[PDB]
Amino acid sequence: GNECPELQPPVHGKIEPSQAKYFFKDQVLVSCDTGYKVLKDNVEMDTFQIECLKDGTWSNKIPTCKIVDCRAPGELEHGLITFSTRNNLTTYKSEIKYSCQEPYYKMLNNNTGIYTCSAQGVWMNKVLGRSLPTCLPVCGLPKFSRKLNGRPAQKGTTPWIAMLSHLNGQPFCGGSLLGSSWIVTAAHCLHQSLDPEDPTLRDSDLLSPSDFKIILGKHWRLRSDENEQHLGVKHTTLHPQYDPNTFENDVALVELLESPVLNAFVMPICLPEGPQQEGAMVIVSGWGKQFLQRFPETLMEIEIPIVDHSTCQKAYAPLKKKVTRDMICAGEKEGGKDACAGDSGGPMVTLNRERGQWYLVGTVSWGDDCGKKDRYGVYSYIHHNKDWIQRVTGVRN
Structure with missing residues (x-):
């Protein structure tokens, strides 16, 4: 030998140690700049080693630097x-x-x-x-858009409402889509009627994800759409302080097994960002007979004002029914037929201007029998439990 030829550092690379002349048994590492690596036969490496052989040739050729x-x-x-x-x-x-x-x-x-x-x-x-x-x-x-009580709802103007039906499609409650996978409804929608002689809620009473499904984008009460999305139920969570006898904290959350495809007919309703006022106008929707003579063919709605807590309590006091602070009332006049608006769990929404956004004010409560609640319509005041809901579902506006 015994000297090896001068070495060429690759483009975007270098050689070490940098010697003026290389002799037998000398070794060098070929490396590359930041953002580049050594490429030897399609294998990436930090460094590649060459050595000067006895005959005066390098053990290998200088590899390249690939980005x-x-x-x-x-x-x-x-x-x-x-x-x-x-x-x-x-x-x-x-x-x-x-x-x-x-x-x-x-x-x-x-x-x-x-x-x-x-x-x-x-x-x-x-x-x-x-x-x-x-x-x-x-x-x-x-x-x-809205063409502009009691009246059939215009198709597409209530994309958040959910129908809680039996596996066959028979409705038994309403609900609202929150976020991507949640349905907010009434706690008393998610368990069978309790025994009057033993009014205590037990696990066997609760209905299971196998007993019902959720239907979104539905307009007709009995007929089918192409917009209807039939989703299975994963799990349900009733409010920790739900009292089935007084209907306190009558709110619940249904986690969907599979999430709906969000489109012009299926979208979530916004959470409240503040308490409601007396006289504030809200819209209540449902498929039930409600304030009608007979059951409707399509979804129904009705714009009614909020009633101040006090006046409501006073109207229900003579009936030994305590309207708690977790409850909100609405309607026009006591016994005005609009206390029967909506289905249990159904949405009560209102417009936030000039945000141009709709949000949920409450869920229909106090059962699906209006005779037992003819004074005013009582709903689960969503604002009151926004924290719990947001805590559980992890939903944000």
């Missing part, structure tokens, strides 16, 4: 990936952009959604870092 590949970006549920070039580059320094599926979803915290391929082969966002953005369900924004 790092962040590979395929993480999937954003309800979101979209938009590359910053027509070639969809997933390599070092390249960028992509996450966008939520408008208008049915919006990005949480309005994160830029921009991710860059880092030197360590990971897509990184300035704020979240490695974590992906969150696409939230847009609530209370109906896509169909």
Whole structure:
């Protein structure tokens, strides 16, 4: 030998140790700059080692430096990936952009959604870092308009209402879609009538996810739509302080087994962000006979004002029925037939201007027999238990 030829550092790389002349048994590591790695026969490596042989030749040839590949970006549920070039580059320094599926979803915290391929082969966002953005369900924004009591509801104007039916489709309660997977309803909808001689709620009384289903995007009471989504039930949670005899905290939460596809006919209703006032106008909807002579063919609605707590209590006091602070009343005049509005668990909503958003004020309560509640319509004051609901479902407006 015994000297080996001068070595050429690869592009975007280097060689160590850097000697003026190399002689037998000398060794060198070939490495690459930040964002690049050594490429030897399609195997990536931090360094590759060469040595000077006795005959004066190097053990191998200088490999090359290949740019790092962040590979395929993480999937954003309800979101979209938009590359910053027509070639969809997933390599070092390249960028992509996450966008939520408008208008049915919006990005949480309005994160830029921009991710860059880092030197360590990971897509990184300035704020979240490695974590992906969150696409939230847009609530209370109906896509169909209102033509402008008692009256059949216009198709598409109540995309949040849920029908709690038997496995065959027979309704027995109402409900509202919250977030992506939750149905808020009345606690007394989720258990069989208790024994008058032993009025205590027990687990066997509760009905199971196998006993009923949820139907969304439904307009006709008995007829079928193409918009109807029949979903199975996963689990149910009645309010911890639900009293089936006084109907205190008569609110419950149904976790759907599979989530509905959000569209022009199926969207969640917004949670309350503040208490309601006396005289405030609300809308109550349902499929029951309600204030009608006979059962309707389509969903029904009625715009009625809120009644101040006190006046309600006073009207029910002579009947030994205590209207608790977790309850809200509505209607026009006591015994005015509009105290029978809605189905148990059904929604009571109102408009938040100029937010142009609808939100849930209460759920129909005190049972499905209006004779036992003819003074005023009593509902589970959602505002009162917003914390528990938000705590359990993890839902945000």
